[PDB]
Amino acid sequence: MTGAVCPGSFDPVTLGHLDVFERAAAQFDEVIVAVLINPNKAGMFTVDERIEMIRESTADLPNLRVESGQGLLVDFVRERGLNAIVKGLRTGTDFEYELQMAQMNKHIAGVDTFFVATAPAYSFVSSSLAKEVATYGGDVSALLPASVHQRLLGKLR
Amino acid sequence: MTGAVCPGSFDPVTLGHLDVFERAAAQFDEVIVAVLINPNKAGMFTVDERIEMIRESTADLPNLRVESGQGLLVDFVRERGLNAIVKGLRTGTDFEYELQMAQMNKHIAGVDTFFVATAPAYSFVSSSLAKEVATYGGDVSALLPASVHQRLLGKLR
Amino acid sequence: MTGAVCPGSFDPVTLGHLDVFERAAAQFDEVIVAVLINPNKAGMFTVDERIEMIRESTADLPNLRVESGQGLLVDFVRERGLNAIVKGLRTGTDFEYELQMAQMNKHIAGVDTFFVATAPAYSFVSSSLAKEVATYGGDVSALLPASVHQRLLGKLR
Amino acid sequence: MTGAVCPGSFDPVTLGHLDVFERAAAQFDEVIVAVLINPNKAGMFTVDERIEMIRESTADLPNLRVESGQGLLVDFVRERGLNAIVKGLRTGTDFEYELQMAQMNKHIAGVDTFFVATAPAYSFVSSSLAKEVATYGGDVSALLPASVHQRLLGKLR
Amino acid sequence: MTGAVCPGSFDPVTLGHLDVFERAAAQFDEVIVAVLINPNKAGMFTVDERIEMIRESTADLPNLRVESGQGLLVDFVRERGLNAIVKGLRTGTDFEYELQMAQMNKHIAGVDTFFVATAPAYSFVSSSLAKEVATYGGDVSALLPASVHQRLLGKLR
């Protein structure tokens, strides 16, 4: 009974994230996407909206579910009986930042972290940059799930 | 039925490698350590010796086996019914190098790659540096499995 | 007929920037320095001040002009019938950041980005650090053009 | 008589910091730990609390003294008749940031900077991450000096 | 009349290279692709074979020419009345290596270097890795120009 948690703010989920979800879901029996609620940033979408967007985009993944999360990620992981985190990485800078978190998380709770390399086609997409470009009129429709994109257009208009 | 391959030259296997093996074996139903034979470098230990050293060091891991490998790693992986590779990373430089390989391997064969961060205590150990230091008389006994260390002393004397 | 846009906040312009301008102006028929303004973030110098400081220190570059703008850089570029951005880089971290921006800008508008390595002498110079150092009385006279240094000291007092 | 300044917010001091202090005190005739006060960012501990926590953790270092500092670091260093800064580095991006600061500090005041590599065991610890983890109930006792940990428990209640 | 040299071994040219060539030819009045000959390392293709493969792949670039080159690159550039090199970059370590070469080339001869970021789709391709993969039966047809791929099959038999 293997399993992994995929955390993020996902504000909104991108095709880069979806690619990671698909790859995690192909290698672990159970995947939980953890939408991390931060009260020190509302962001663009509500936690409810983010969850909904991810659920819509992951319907073809039978072994994946989506839940909101607060507090220590390692507590989220262990309270669900798991002890692995899966995250995507774009750059060596990402790796150095996530290395520190991964080692801390292993130290405090025995939770391991597995990283995957970004899909080449989505190397430059981040939720933040997608929102920024879209805000000023750039076409990001090829970078986001179809559902998300329409919802993003809504938030701007 | 999940599974992953852990490749390397392992000449010899270190405690850094063993840590990765243990972590892979804890998260996948089946782990295969692939000792990659290169004819353009005999190295210090024979493929047979490397395999033996890994088997000795991994006896407490029931779901791990060790095999030699040649040619395309993705062929090794797919011919055994798997499509995941697990490798440890120490630095952002490691990540950039392995990112390219991971993306190539996904492109040519659909095989994914999962990375784990090195254990902090073994951040500086590599097979090559361990051999170099030992060759000049430095004590690397805390960096290698007990079995390996004695075998290394043998190869030097 | 060839041309490029050199963007930045230039608050204020430094000798590192001027080196980039000179090198761009030597290689393309026209160069536009784009002073990009955040209408929600004032910065130290006004737009007219930033432009004046750049003009005064680029008087010997006949094919360079200075204009301000806001919003998407690729719109500024394309509205002038150009298709190239030129930016200096100091570090691998700069490169990772700017590579993602460049790939996004090419994706959304087909605009290309050319990078140039910092002059060794100015590799540690940034507008932000120069302002910070000067705020606490450090001597940054050799890092800024004459058109800038005393105006900066004036702002701070 | 050789000497160096070890600057930081140290809010609170960690075992990573202490390792740097010990190694600096072993190599320089005198070390001054400079606890840097920032008026706009009151941390978790007051400057006096931070100084006392460092003094307790460095009781066996007779050539190391602890003082509060404000303003331009190279002024602090020169006002005490010294000309060197010592800082620990964990990652390549630590180095890129500190290299530019070191080159700037050498340019503006002739003060040099010596770096040491983190101890492997503490490569992932930072004051900020330790505080964050502790705030949400994580056990960071193995990452901080005994005394600090007791005080940290106190501030969380 | 603006111009730049695009140097490499191009053994063989890849779609990553071609993307750089196209973008350079779009921005400079002339581009010379310099196929660098190294007497001690005969690659897979002869210099003449490499030149013909590039000519076939760049047939639609009328301002781009292909020549063989030997010796100091900045001599090659200056002998053709040019003063700029253009190269593609994939990763931060590509940048660190090329930054030092670019600074050296500017110091010794006044020749500048412009970099472009890789196309996302080809970020992982290199001539060396494509050859290695192909040698062991991997399909690299989507990574190389049509013609190159046919010739590559030929050299493997």
Add this chain to the structure above:
Amino acid sequence: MTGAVCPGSFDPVTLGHLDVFERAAAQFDEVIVAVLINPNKAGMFTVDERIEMIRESTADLPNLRVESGQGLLVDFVRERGLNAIVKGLRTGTDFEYELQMAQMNKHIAGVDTFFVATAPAYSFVSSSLAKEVATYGGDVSALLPASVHQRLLGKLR
């Protein structure tokens, strides 16, 4: 009583190295430049030549001496009753490499390593690249001390 060892192959010594020597000599009571020789790899200059070139360019540093050695650097250090190594760093890549070496050297012998940032002017300078450039006739006169430049040209002819 304080002291440090500055190691390298110094084949030949460059202005980047001399900058590091000067800074080390300003901060510790004694500095030993350790010319480390590979008895299986001749290099361009003999040991006596390397030492002579360093002595001639460090005559104004009364507390610096030059000695050759081989094998483990930590043995060279400890045999002189010292416990510190000082090395310059140019890039994050240098840092990742040297951090692993420093941690290994501390592990096996308790010897510490202090790093210093390259002078901006010499950030792109290395013995290897200087030799390569000079081999093909590039002007490296401003990158090497007078004690080195013409001797290098002599070797090449």
